[PDB]
Amino acid sequence: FLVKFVKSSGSSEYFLKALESIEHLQILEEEAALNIKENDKSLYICDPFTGVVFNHLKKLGCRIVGPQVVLYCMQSQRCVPRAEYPVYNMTMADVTISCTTLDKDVREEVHKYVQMMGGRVYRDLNMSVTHLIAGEVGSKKYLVAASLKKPVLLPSWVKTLWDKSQQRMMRYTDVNMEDYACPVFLGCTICVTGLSSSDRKEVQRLTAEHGGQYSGMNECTHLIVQVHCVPVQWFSDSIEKGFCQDETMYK
Amino acid sequence: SPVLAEDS
């Protein structure tokens, strides 16, 4: 396929750096790109992904990609993603995400940024998913990803990978997963009964430390006993294994 | 199947 670089205003330095790396490639001035009126099924390099030019080509249905994608794939045509949406860079190439327990609109934002960073997205948790994005613990997707020890990260991981990769070229491992891991008890309100005052204080502390809420029936999500009624072994195993445990396995 | 957990 042909490659048409679209010179535009507001572009980053990576656009220029992509021109210094190239005959079947055309270099279009902004005006020549504004006079396009159809979709020639060629690859268009655009930078930025804002402005009347980019939205024009996008409206026509053109295959659009950022210069970071060029610096990533270089002369490999097969390396270029093959999708109906513009890909800005390849920060998330090889990442396949699914989401769980998120607001639908946030979910679709996540999907958007992942796809724009060269990643894949599925709505179910299939065997291709490499990362689970979660807004809180406890879901079927969550427990499954835990049992397989797949990373379960917060949405911010995607956001921080977008915002940062706007300026520089990077990959998804260039951020520490641990700093964006879903806390073991995020979304949980932990309540206790029949525990020594000391153990009680321990549950309080560890709950707050692992992203949960402590409250000393409508407010509780879990009830530690000597709503989910679980033994303390559920709490300690959740902390020890690094994931909220399946409560039905601790009844 | 390839689906381990379905969409919510």
**What is the H/E string of chain B?**
E
Q: Identify the most extensive interface between protein chains.
A: A-B, 15 and 7 residues
Query: Structural class of the helices, strands and pairings of chain B?
Result: mainly beta
**Content-based structural category of chain A:** alpha/beta
The helix/strand order of chain A is EHEHEHEHEHEEEHEHEHEEEH
Task: Calculate the terminal CA-CA distance of chain B, rounded to whole Å.
Answer: 18 Å
Query: Compute the gyration radius of chain A: what is it?
Result: 24 Å
CATH level 3 topology of the largest domain in chain A? Rossmann fold
Neighbour order of strands in the largest sheet of chain A: 2-1-3-4
Number of helices of chain B: 0
Q: How much β-strand is present in the residues of chain B? A: 35-45%
Largest sheet of chain B: none
The proportion of strand residues of chain A reads 15-25%
Strand tally of chain A, please? Answer: 13
Beta strands of chain B, count: 1
The helix fraction of chain B, in percent, is under 10%
Text of the CATH class of the largest domain in chain A: Alpha Beta
Helix content percent band of chain A = 25-40%
CATH superfamily of the largest domain in chain A: BRCT domain
Structure at a glance:
The complex is a heterodimer of chains A (251) and B (8). Chain A is α/β, with parallel strands linked by helices.
